[PDB]
Design a protein around this nucleic acid. Structure first.
Ligand code: MG
Ligand code: ZN
Ligand code: ZN
Lengths: 98, 79, 99, 278, 1336, 49
DNA sequence: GAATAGCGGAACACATAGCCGGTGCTATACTTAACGTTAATTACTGGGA
DNA sequence: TCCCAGTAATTAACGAGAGCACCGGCTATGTGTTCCGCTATTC
């Protein structure tokens, strides 16, 4: 089984399960520790930002690929916005500050 | 035409300044503002960048000098 | 037909498959002996002699099968079924001793 | 010190009012209906046990027990609002109607996640009662055709009303027994395009704009305002007749000419009707 | 974009500012149309339109009409993704308390109010009135009233007193509370109190109130008034196929809350009697308090399926929450998986990719190339080209794959070698071909194990996978300097078979003019692969500064060892292949090649080793037949003898001479003897069975038996799986762990019967269940270990310290376990390690100890090297690159940036699946009793008056090979500082008789030694000596409790013998249960026995050492150095008075009197020496003997779990976990700084705060370091997200939210969550650029 | 299953850990050619459109 | 090319009717509901020094 | 009067594969107009 770009799940824009909904392999937390254990930061960032979750990000990633330029404009993963609106739907004002 | 990046690491230390310098150089060559110094052997821009590191004619100092010189040349185009 | 790795035997200690392989070679040797006796049309008599000798060995087994009660069609039909290899029953802890 | 769950506290609480006699009920209602609030408080406060008794029967529907009790309380408040002692009747007979109907409307309202109206739920309950009485005559499940037979109603109507009895499932329940796969893993976001269709559209838009500028100006302005494409609004042939070229027939003519030129331009790139429409 | 994530309490007006409308109706959608219903939980004026740029009426439908709120619907046309980010708010009709600030167990409303939780929930459930500023006319402020108590109090006080009930009462409490004045009152009361329980209570209350003042919150925002709803597309109502629907379970709980809020509103509006509105507020408050969490407040409310609904807090907690399912690890595009196979023709940076996976993954690159070639001008044509898979899309794929690494990865990813990179090579197949040398790293078998692939898209990642994750870069393990690409099982057997000799093969004795005529001889079949042949080789040394010097010779060797030599590169000496060359001897060739030559001619060497080892095991034909298991002929004789002996012992047991327990270990003895004798009598039959003859008679040699060459060579076998193929397979266990008497005495060649097969099946179902549960424990262990060691990142180049631990070889009683050289290989020094000619520094102070400085220590035989360690590094937030050490999977020092914390967590995590009377000198050295007082006994020898008595065997070179520990009171057969032989029983003692030996001589007396009160009469009834033995204090009368039998010594001249050296008297107050055999008035000598006194798991041991749990019998230690005594003895507590020579005497400690004490009640104990015995907690080790003792205790006590199972792990990986356990250090005296007394601030911050204060003129803070376990030191973290992305989340978010906490995004889990670069490797320089440009 | 003429020897690394060579005459004889029968369905619902 | 006429017809909007959909009302009397861990740790509470 | 031991709660335990009146207000529904588009005729 292999998926380039298929159908993303409903609530969090992430790929689906294996081979029946044509889905991406799970890059679980142990593999995240394995990438952190190298010096590999860009691979991990694109892996959990633009291969997976940043909704406006991955169309820019795809159009960068098909136009022959392997750059990424990562942004912020959608599952973290979901976590933001879920913690905040308790009485817990959690905000990004600068 | 590349298996081990070891001699590049002999030039540029730390094993990570290598990746950032080679990324900056391959961005110069991919987004086609540049051209390779050493000849390509139908290698991808990544490996031409690493072979350029291995000759030692690209590093962070060479890149910063050439970018500052490029900005000086672009400022010389005002007329 | 299949080349298998030997070093998987003595660490996993499934030494039974070496004897399964050996008895498979025995049974296939018997099948090819009957097939050679059947390639040329030898006789149903000499075929009865050989198949009965193959059912005699070894020592102190049950199902003594006496091929004199087979009526020269079931010897033929039995030979046509054994010719790819005489199938051999080895019960679980009653076994087939290596002799 | 009571154990602090809501049901035990309430059911222990409601016994602190003596049940009223008939002349007592009539006198309290006489005081109540002329605006003495203490009499209303006594009448509603006493007959709470009637509400627990009536709403005891309506258990194990969609609503939990205390929801049924509290909705019966509303009807009891309505009952003392509109009780008449002048009929001489015992209060329980008149309040039973109001409490029973305002728990029935509660189960008809607040059960289904997609709220069906009253009459649809009464119509569905008619069919379910018919199926329960029909199952003992043929010892199998009565069909939609069988209920439509026994009520002589159209089969499509009974089919629709039974399909409105869907029992809307959860998402968070796991599938296959093993607790690793709920419906969030199965469902696909169908409205959101992935990157493939989203880049095909942008590449098609840029290709359209490129082919239009490859076409001459008078044709492409007609074909731009004609479909609202090149930063324009989708205009009528009569509208661009009065706006650009006064002969509407010539506007149709230049439109057909531009469409023929674009047909040639598209087929030079190998994109035929089989290519774009399979 | 943003620097920090701030969390705080949300006011009832912040919630009205997020929100876009009040959800007033329960109903979700319409039912005929599927239109969102105005205005329930899915609306469109509230949360936004359902279709992109389209209203609900549809009268405005375009991007041209963007933004305008409609008139028929009120729906603002926008994108339709605004329904994921728009909240609505419910207006609750009565306030209800928030369940997180009420029921999370250190309850914030509770300890903020200082009201007990039972009294609060008796108010919230409307049971009891509570006063709210009634004043002290009669009542207290936070005093509750029951109903009738309230009624009579209301009768006495209609006015001047107010007691509300419910959440309005609690809110009037909180908004009526003053913070500054109450904080001042509690600060004064904390100042005045002395009870440490109340001191800790007031510290906690003061800290909560001070965080409430410092954060911008108010206390009354804990009570929800306006409840916010989730946006609709985070709890969708997706239609299933067929007119079917499916809801997230939040819509039900929201519908329940909206229903009870509407009914409460109408109940107030009807002016209901108060019982119904109190039941209604009780019913809401709970519908809410369920929505926010289910199962907390009583039992959870359930759905139709008899399952509890998934609430808001359920979508965050646990493995199914966002934090470790959707946010830490995500499912990832450009990925796929398959089964794997071998394909051993690969070079080791390559991998086999099928033409169907590689066409799928590399899809957008092929579109971007087919647009480039002009083969398709659009993407709608370039898609249909690769759809039908034309002839020209297969030439594009070979271009776009050429130097693009892919990312192979197995499923249980343990360490960083579980994800590697490979330049792929296209296969016509469906499986992933994969080099054989890397399956050792992946722990991959080809029995159906599946590996996932991944595509580095971006240009930085294609370089990251080539410079850091390529297979040719990872040849050393990160755990230790051992190589990782060692030849595994087939190549090594082939290399064993090639590098051998028989006594007479073809061509033995011919001379050979090179390693190429050896190939020409063997391929022409003119000599065997094992023939002792004089060849000439030409080996290159690089003796000078890289000068390869030729030296031809004439080596007596084999035709196999000469064929193999052409594979070996230039610099290696010939004597590395002039042996049998098994498995161990290969990895010490492919490591010396890495050290001598470098990386590249070792990566080219490992491929040639594999290509030769496969090719020469092909021609070996090395099979295994049933005749290769030579059952020994003496097996029958041995078994007959051992079956005679067991019947003899069985007769003797029936003759009553021995019991069952004595014949048990006598039958197990004879069977464990015969089980050895069988296995030893078959090994001389296996290995020597070749007896061949060269020009003569016979010569025995090492066998060419096939099952010997697969265990002798180390290629997949041992000497313990053999002896179960030919020898007897010995004794077996039972489910109690007890060993079965009658063992199983048949090999697997002879077959087993029914009973022997049944016996040896518990041993298998015990081993399989072991590996079943072992992985479930070892996953959780490394899960904890990673999160305790996240933010540790090599951040400096030299911290500049001279502290650091001292290293010693591991001499654990007998031999050296691990020598000094292998502990201090690759770690820089803290002092100048100098030769025992101590006027000259042998090494400098800060040299990095590689091998060439290891050997200078190995020649000059240094025993103790002070080293620079991680736990002593003086880096705030990180570890200096010197103090860490070597890279360990690179030969150089550690690169600045590289996150050691995760790679040192995984190296302890991944081996976790492999876990569960007299002293005799046995060598030649000199006796050294170290730092111990010991008196001359009455026999003239040396008896021991020391508790910590240590025996050393100092060699002729001044080092130790054998160290020992002696107990108290042992007679020394030898003396100190003198050479003794081996086998010498140097010390001796009874393990039962505890001597209370003296140090002075003369006529002893039985002073304060009386009968009837203190001692009793139990004389020697067997011999006739008047033994004056002592009872115990539990049995004797109360007139002789503290009166102990002392031994005062006088002479016959009226003078008293006291302690020499001092002026103190010489008496020894004997405790209870003392058996004295001497008399009073008789002469005693020095060292005479005064009174003869009588007396783990593999994985959970590691999991409790890193957790630092208190062991059940702690070794009570000496909290302050000084003399010891016993205070007033309680009923079970002996208050051990520890009087220092100068310091504070009254430290007494209640010792459980039933515990066996050790100190003889009068000894001046050194601080931190034992009072009783038992395993000690690391908390006591830390507090008494300091940090450098606990960092030796933990790394010894866990290396003694790993080396027991034969797992080597370098000790820096445990030193950093120790360093991450003590990041927290509570204060003792605050000093001039801004800290409290009993608070536990983190030691890194107090290492700066008083650092600038001592840099100032002020005084510092006095702080004791504190140790926490890895489930607590990872949960007490500054960044609240790297602690909430873990175990309990409802605790950590609540504790942070009442504190106004603010993550700084400095660790690694936080930057992973938020989606930016981690601050570790390639992303380290960018974070340096960010932190430089910021604050500038 | 099907009984096949087997041999125990390491052959050029292609049967390294547990991998297994198979002669082509096995797949010419179709000794392991299993038949799989799947079922595909197509419901024709009554949508509201 | 270009005006004009016919003409389909799509559809859009407007006005209506009609019919979904929400609500109120019913009068013997009726009166208090629904079956295991494992370990660790910590907060609590009754009991002892 | 403070320590202390039993008790109860909370957290964790791999990976990936009824029944009628009534009204009103929405909405489908005729239907007109209308507007657009298309075609066809004629200067
Ligand atoms: Mg496997
Ligand atoms: Zn609208
Ligand atoms: Zn340092």
């Amino acid at each position: 089984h292999a998926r380039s770009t298929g159908s993303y799940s409903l609530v969090t824009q992430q790929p689906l399960g294996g081979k029946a909904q044509f889905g991406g392999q799970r890059f679980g937390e142990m593999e995240v520790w394995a990438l952190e254990a190298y010096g590999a930061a860009y691979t991990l960032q694109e892996m959990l930002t633009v291969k997976s979750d940043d909704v406006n990000g991955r169309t820019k990633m795809y159009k960068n690929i098909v136009d022959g330029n392997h750059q990424m404009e990562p942004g912020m993963p959608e599952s973290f916005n979901v976590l933001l609106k879920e913690i905040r739907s308790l009485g817990i004002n959690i905000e990004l500050e600068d | 035409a590349r298996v081990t990046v070891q001699d590049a690491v002999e030039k540029i230390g730390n094993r990570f300044d290598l990746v950032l310098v080679a990324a900056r150089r391959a961005r110069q060559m991919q987004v086609g503002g540049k051209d390779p110094l050493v000849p390509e052997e139908n290698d991808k821009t990544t490996v031409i960048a690493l072979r350029e590191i291995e000759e030692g004619l690209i590093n962070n100092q060479i890149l910063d000098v050439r970018e500052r010189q490029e900005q000086q040349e672009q400022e010389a185009a005002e007329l | 037909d299949i080349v298998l790795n030997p070093l998987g035997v003595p660490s996993r200690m499934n030494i039974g498959q070496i004897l399964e392989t050996h008895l498979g070679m025995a049974a296939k040797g018997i099948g090819d002996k009957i097939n050679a006796m059947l390639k040329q049309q030898q006789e149903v008599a000499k075929l009865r002699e050989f198949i009965q000798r193959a059912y005699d060995l070894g020592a102190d087994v049950r199902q003594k099968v006496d091929l004199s009660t087979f009526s020269d069609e079931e010897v033929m039909r039995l030979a046509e079924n054994l010719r790819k290899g005489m199938p051999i029953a080895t019960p679980v802890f009653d076994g087939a001793k290596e002799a | 010190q009571r154990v602090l769950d809501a049901t035990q506290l309430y059911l222990g609480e409601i016994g602190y009012s003596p049940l009223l006699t008939a002349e007592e009920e009539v006198y309290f209602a006489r005081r109540a209906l002329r605006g003495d609030v203490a009499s209303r408080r006594r009448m509603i406060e006493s007959n709470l046990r009637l509400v627990v008794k009536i709403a005891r029967r309506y258990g194990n529907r969609g609503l939990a027990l205390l929801d049924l009790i509290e909705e019966g309380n509303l009807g009891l408040i309505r009952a003392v609002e509109k009780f008449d002692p002048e009929r001489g009747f015992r209060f329980s007979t008149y309040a039973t109607w109001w409490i029973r109907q305002t728990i029935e409307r509660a189960i008809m309202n607040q059960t289904r996640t997609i709220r069906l109206p009253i009459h649809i739920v009464k119509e569905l309950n008619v069919y379910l009662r018919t199926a329960r009485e029909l199952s003992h005559k043929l010892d199998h499940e009565p069909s939609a055709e069988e209920i439509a037979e026994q009520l002589d109603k159209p089969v499509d109507d009974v089919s629709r009303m039974l399909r409105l009895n869907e029992r809307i499932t959860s998402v968070d329940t796991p599938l296959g027994g093993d607790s690793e796969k709920a419906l969030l893993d199965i469902l696909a976001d169908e409205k959101e395009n992935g990157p493939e269709d989203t880049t095909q559209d942008d590449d098609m838009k840029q290709s359209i704009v490129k082919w239009l500028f490859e076409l001459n100006a008078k044709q492409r302005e007609v074909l731009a305002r004609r479909f609202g494409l090149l930063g324009y609004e989708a205009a009528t042939l009569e509208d661009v007749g009065r706006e650009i070229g006064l002969t509407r027939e010539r506007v149709r003519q230049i439109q057909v000419e531009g469409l023929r030129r674009l047909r040639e331009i598209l087929q030079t790139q190998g994109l035929n009707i089989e290519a774009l429409f399979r | 974009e943003f620097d920090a994530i701030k969390i705080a309490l949300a006011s009832p007006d912040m919630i009205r500012s997020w929100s876009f409308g009040e959800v007033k109706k329960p109903e979700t959608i319409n039912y005929r149309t599927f239109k969102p219903e105005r205005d329930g939980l899915f609306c469109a004026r509230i949360f936004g339109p359902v279709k992109d740029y389209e209203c609900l009426c549809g009268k405005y439908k375009r991007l041209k009409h963007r933004g305008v709120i409609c008139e028929k619907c009120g729906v603002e046309v926008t994108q339709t993704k605004v329904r994921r980010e728009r909240m609505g708010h419910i207006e609750l009709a009565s306030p209800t308390a928030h369940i997180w600030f009420l029921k999370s167990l250190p309850s914030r409303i509770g300890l903020l109010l200082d009201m007990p939780l039972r009294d609060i929930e008796r108010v919230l459930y409307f049971e009891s009135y509570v006063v709210i500023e009634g004043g002290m006319t009669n009542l207290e402020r936070q005093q509750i009233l029951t109903e009738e108590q309230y009624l009579d109090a209301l009768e006495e006080f209609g006015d001047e007193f107010d007691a509300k009930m419910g959440a309005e009462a609690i809110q009037a409490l909180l908004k009526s509370m003053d913070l500054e004045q109450e904080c001042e009152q509690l600060r004064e009361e904390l100042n005045e109190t002395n009870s440490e329980t109340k001191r800790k209570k007031l510290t906690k209350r003061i800290k909560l109130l001070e965080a409430f003042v410092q954060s911008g919150n108010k206390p009354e925002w804990m009570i929800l008034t306006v409840l916010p709803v989730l946006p609709p597309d985070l709890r969708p109502l997706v239609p299933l196929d067929g007119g079917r629907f499916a809801t997230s379970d939040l819509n039900d709980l929201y519908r329940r809350v909206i229903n009870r809020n509407n009914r409460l509103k109408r109940l107030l509006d009807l002016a209901a009697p108060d019982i119904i509105v109190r039941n209604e507020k009780r019913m809401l408050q709970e519908a809410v308090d369920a929505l926010l969490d289910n199962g907390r407040r009583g039992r959870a409310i359930t759905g139709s399926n008899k399952r509890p609904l998934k609430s808001l807090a359920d979508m965050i907690k646990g493995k199914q929450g966002r934090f470790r399912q959707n946010l830490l690890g995500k499912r990832v595009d450009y990925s796929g998986r398959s089964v794997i196979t071998v394909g051993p023709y690969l070079r080791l940076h390559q991998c086999g990719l099928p033409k169907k996976m590689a066409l799928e993954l590399f899809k957008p690159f092929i579109y971007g190339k087919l647009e480039l070639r002009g083969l398709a001008t659009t993407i709608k044509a370039a898609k249909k080209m690769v759809e039908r898979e034309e002839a020209v899309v297969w030439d594009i794929l070979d271009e776009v794959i050429r130097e693009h690494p892919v990312l192979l990865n197995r499923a249980p990813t343990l360490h960083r070698l579980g994800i590697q990179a490979f330049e792929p090579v296209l296969i016509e197949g469906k499986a992933i071909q994969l080099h054989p040398l890397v399956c050792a790293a992946y722990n991959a078998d080809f029995d159906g194990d599946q590996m996932a692939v991944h595509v580095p898209l971006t240009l930085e990642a294609q370089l990251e996978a080539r410079a850091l994750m390529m297979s040719t870069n990872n040849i050393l393990s990160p755990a230790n300097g051992e190589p990782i690409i060692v030849p595994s099982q087939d190549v090594v057997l082939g290399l064993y078979y090639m590098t051998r000799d028989c006594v007479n093969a073809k061509g033995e004795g011919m001379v050979l003019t090179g390693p190429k005529e050896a190939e020409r001889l063997y391929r022409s079949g003119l000599a065997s692969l094992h023939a002792r042949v004089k060849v000439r080789i030409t080996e290159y040394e690089k003796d000078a500064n890289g000068e390869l010097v030729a030296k031809t010779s004439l080596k007596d060797t084999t035709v196999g060892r000469a064929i193999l030599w052409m594979i070996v590169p230039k610099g290696l000496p010939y004597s590395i292949v002039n042996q049998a060359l098994g498995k161990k001897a290969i990895s010490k060739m492919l490591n010396t090649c890495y050290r001598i030559l470098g990386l590249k001619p070792t990566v080219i060497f490992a491929d040639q080793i594999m290509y030769t080892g496969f090719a020469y095991a092909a021609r070996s034909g090395a099979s295994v037949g049933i005749d290769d298991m030579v059952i020994p002929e003496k097996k029958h004789e041995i078994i007959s003898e051992a079956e005679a002996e067991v019947a003899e012992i069985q007769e003797q047991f029936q003759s009553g001479l021995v019991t069952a327990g004595e014949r048990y270990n006598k039958v197990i003895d004879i069977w464990a003897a015969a089980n050895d004798r069988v296995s030893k009598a078959m090994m001389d039959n296996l290995q020597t069975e070749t007896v061949i003859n060269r020009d003569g008679q016979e010569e025995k040699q090492v066998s060419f038996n096939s099952i010997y060459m697969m265990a002798d060579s180390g290629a997949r076998g041992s000497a313990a799986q053999i002896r179960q193929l030919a020898g007897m397979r010995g004794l077996m266990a039972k489910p109690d762990g007890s060993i079965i008497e009658t063992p199983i005495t048949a090999n697997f060649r002879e077959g087993l019967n029914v009973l022997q097969y049944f016996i040896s099946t518990h041993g298998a179902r015990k081993g399989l269940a072991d590996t079943a549960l072992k992985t479930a424990n070892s996953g959780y262990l490394t899960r904890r270990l990673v999160d305790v060691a996240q933010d540790l990142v090599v951040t400096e180049d030299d911290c500049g310290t001279h502290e650091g631990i001292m290293m010693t070889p591991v001499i654990e009683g007998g031999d050296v376990k691990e020598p000094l050289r292998d502990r201090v290989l690759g770690r820089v020094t803290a002092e100048d390690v100098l030769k025992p000619g101590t006027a000259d520094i042998l090494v400098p102070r800060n040299t990095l100890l590689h091998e060439q400085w290891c050997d200078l220590l190995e020649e000059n035989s240094v025993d103790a090297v002070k080293v620079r360690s991680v736990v002593s590094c003086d880096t705030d937030f990180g570890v200096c690159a010197h103090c860490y050490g070597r890279d360990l999977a690179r030969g150089h020092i550690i690169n600045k940036g590289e996150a050691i914390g995760v790679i040192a967590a995984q190296s302890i995590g991944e081996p976790g699946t492999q876990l569960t009377s007299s002293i005799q000198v046995k060598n030649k050295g000199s006796i050294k009793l170290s730092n111990v007082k010991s008196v001359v006994n009455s026999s003239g020898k040396l008896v021991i008056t020391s508790r910590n008595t240590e025996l050393k065997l100092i060699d002729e070179f001044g080092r130790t090979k054998e160290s020992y520990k002696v107990p108290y009171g042992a007679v020394l057969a030898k003396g100190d500082g003198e050479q003794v032989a081996g086998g010498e029983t140097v010390a001796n003692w009874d393990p039962h008789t505890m001597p209370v030996i003296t140090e002075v001589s003369g006529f002893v007396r039985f002073t304060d030694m009386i009968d009837g009160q203190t001692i009793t009469r139990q004389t020697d009834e067997l011999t006739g000596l008047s033994s004056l033995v002592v009872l115990d204090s539990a049995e004797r009368t109360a007139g002789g409790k503290d009166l102990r039998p002392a031994l005062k010594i006088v002479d016959a001249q009226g003078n008293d013998v006291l302690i020499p050296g001092t002026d103190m008297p010489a008496q020894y107050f004997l405790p209870g249960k003392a058996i004295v055999q001497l008399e009073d008035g008789v002469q005693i000598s020095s060292g005479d026995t005064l009174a003869r006194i009588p007396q783990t798991g593999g994985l959970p041991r590691v999991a409790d050492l890193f957790e630092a749990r208190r062991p059940k019998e702690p070794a009570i230690l000496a909290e302050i150095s000084g003399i010891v005594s016993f205070g007033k003895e309680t009923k079970g507590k002996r208050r051990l008075v520890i009087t220092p020579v100068d310091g504070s005497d009254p430290y007494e400690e209640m010792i459980p009197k039933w515990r066996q004490l050790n100190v003889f009640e009068g000894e001046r104990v050194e601080r931190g020496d034992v009072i009783s015995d038992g395993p000690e907690a690391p908390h006591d080790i830390l507090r008494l003997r300091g940090v450098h003792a606990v960092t030796r205790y933990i790394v010894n006590e866990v290396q003694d779990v790993y080396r027991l199972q034969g797992v080597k792990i370098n000790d820096k990986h445990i030193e950093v976990i120790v360093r991450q356990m003590l990041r927290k250090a509570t204060i003792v005296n605050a000093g001039s700084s801004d800290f409290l007394e009993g608070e536990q601030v983190e030691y890194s911050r107090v290492k700066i705060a008083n650092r600038e204060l001592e840099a100032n003129g002020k005084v510092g803070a006095t702080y004791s370091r504190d140790l926490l376990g890895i489930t607590k030191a990872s949960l007490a973290t500054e960044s609240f997200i790297s602690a909430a992305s873990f175990q309990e989340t409802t605790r950590v978010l609540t504790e942070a939210a009442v504190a106004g906490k603010r993550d700084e995004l400095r660790g690694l889990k936080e930057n992973v969550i938020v989606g930016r670069l981690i601050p570790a490797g390639t992303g380290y320089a960018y974070h340096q650029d960010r932190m430089r440009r910021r604050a500038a | 299953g099907q009984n096949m003429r087997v041999a125990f020897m390491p052959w050029n690394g292609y049967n390294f850990e547990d991998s297994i060579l198979v002669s082509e005459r096995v797949v010419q004889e179709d000794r392991f050619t299993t038949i799989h029968i799947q079922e595909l369905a197509c419901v024709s619902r009554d949508t509201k459109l």
